[PDB]
Amino acid sequence: TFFHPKSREDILNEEAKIVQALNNQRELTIKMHELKREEKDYAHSYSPLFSDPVPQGGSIGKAPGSSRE
């Protein structure tokens, strides 16, 4: 009569919630490992304002015919 253990159903449910939290942390770790080592933009990786990688060089003797696409 002194034995008052938590029932089997509630034990199973609590363990299941724990395992669900653990699998959620697993999937979050995988997602974060995948969002890292994913190619980012030039604005996010180098320069958010001057977002043009194309260099405009000197200006003192700028020859027409020097630009090229």
Binding site: P64, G65, S67, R68
Partner: protein, 171 residues
């Protein structure tokens, strides 16, 4: 490009232009008369010059071979300007560029010949000298009455001609 360095042998080429490229006369004027006629070339060849440079820029590398018609037009317009100078305004032109030669190609030492030449070309050919980029508030330096910077020796022939032109009201 850079200038040559440490050894360099000139070499010419005795080949002719291809036949798909039409012929064009050259300009044939040396440093000083061309410096004297620069502004009169720019007054008349603005569209052709800027079309030449725009087709060079649009070409993006092939400007030497893509811009030949346009450069021929530029050369012809310049030759026309200098032919008009020689036909009509040769004495003042020669005053101006001989004056440039005895100086260091400084236009500040030649204003008395420059005035006569500008008057002559503005009256006969209707081409005037204008320094662009300025405001209405700024005085062009070639119209200043008493500049800070003057020649060591003002050119003799130009002084006599300026005096005679002021005595005859041509200026």
């Amino acid at each position: 490009p850079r200038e040559a360095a440490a050894h360099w042998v000139p070499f010419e080429d005795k080949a002719n232009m291809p036949d798909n490229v039409p012929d064009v006369v050259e300009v044939g004027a040396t440093s000083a008369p061309l410096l004297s006629a620069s502004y009169f070339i720019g007054a008349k060849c603005k569209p052709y010059n800027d079309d030449f440079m725009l087709c060079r820029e649009e070409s993006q590398g092939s400007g030497a071979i893509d811009c030949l018609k346009e450069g021929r037009r530029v050369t012809r317009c310049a030759v026309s300007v200098i032919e008009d100078i020689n036909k009509s305004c040769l004495d003042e032109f020669r005053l101006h560029w001989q004056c440039l030669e005895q100086n260091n190609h400084q236009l500040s030492g030649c204003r008395k010949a420059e005035a006569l030449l500008n008057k002559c070309v503005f009256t006969k050919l209707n081409l005037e000298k204008k320094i662009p980029g300025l405001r209405p508030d700024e005085e062009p330096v070639f119209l200043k009455k008493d500049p800070w910077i003057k020649p060591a020796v003002d050119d003799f022939k130009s002084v006599r001609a300026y005096a005679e032109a002021k005595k005859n009201g041509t200026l």
